[PDB]
């Protein structure tokens, strides 16, 4: 579990969105595993606007933040899970690191701010849904 709180927005994995998230929906995209809802209080996270390929992510299954090297956002095949059928997920970055299903939502960050959230994994890999292209998270 986990979310990004920037401005009056809450960014979560689409597959983990609550009924309150859907009832206050701003934008969702199943191909990216992302959903954004509106919030009453202002959040403290800042979004990175950069092309870093190194950063640090939070792994809840280890209670630890790990430094990682990650690939550029791409279209990657993701196997069938209890949340989606086998499909191509877009804007996904891969890294070598520990992950378990419940680790989804952990933040990946660089020196500039939040880069994305854990979305996929398995066998010593972890995948992150990038958010750096969503410029509208910084306004309105």
Instruction: Enumerate the known binding-site residues for Zn(2+).
Output: 50, 52, 110, 112
Residue 15 or 112 having the CB closest to Zn ion: 112
Whose CA is closest to 79, among 92, 68, 63?
A: 92
- Ranges of H-type helices in 10-132: 19-23
Whose CA is closest to 70, among 94, 102, 36?
A: 94
Would you say 77 and 84 are in contact if contact means Cβ atoms under 8 Å apart? no
How many chain residues interact with ligand A1B5X (CB under 6 A)?
18
| Nearest approach, Cβ of residue 90 and ligand A1B5X (Å) | 11
| Nearest approach, Cβ of residue 127 and ligand A1B5X (Å) | 7
Which of 15, 39, 46, 52 binds Zn ion (CB under 5 A)? It is: 52
Q: Is 107 in the site for Zn ion (CB under 5 A)?
A: no
In eight-state DSSP terms, residue 32 is: G
**How many CB atoms neighbour CB 117 within 10 A?**
26
Q: Which of the residues 92 through 131 are near ligand A1B5X (CB under 6 A)?
A: 99-101, 103-104, 118-122
Question: Which chain residues interact with Zn ion by CB under 5 A?
Answer: 48, 50, 52, 110, 112
């Amino acid at each position: 579990s986990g979310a990004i709180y920037v401005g009056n927005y809450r960014v979560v994995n689409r597959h983990l969105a609550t009924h309150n998230d859907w009832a206050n929906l701003v934008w969702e995209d199943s191909s990216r595993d992302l959903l954004v809802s509106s919030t009453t209080a202002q959040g403290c996270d800042t979004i990175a606007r950069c092309d870093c390929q190194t950063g640090v992510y939070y792994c809840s299954s280890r209670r630890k933040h790990y430094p990682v090297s990650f690939s550029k956002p791409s279209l990657i095949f993701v196997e069938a899970s209890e949340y989606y059928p086998a499909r191509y997920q877009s804007h996904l970055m891969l890294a070598v690191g520990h992950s378990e299903p419940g680790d989804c939502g952990g933040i990946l960050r660089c020196q500039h701010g939040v880069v994305g959230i854990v979305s996929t994994g398995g066998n010593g890999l972890v995948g992150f849904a990038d958010v750096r292209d969503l410029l509208w998270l910084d306004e309105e």
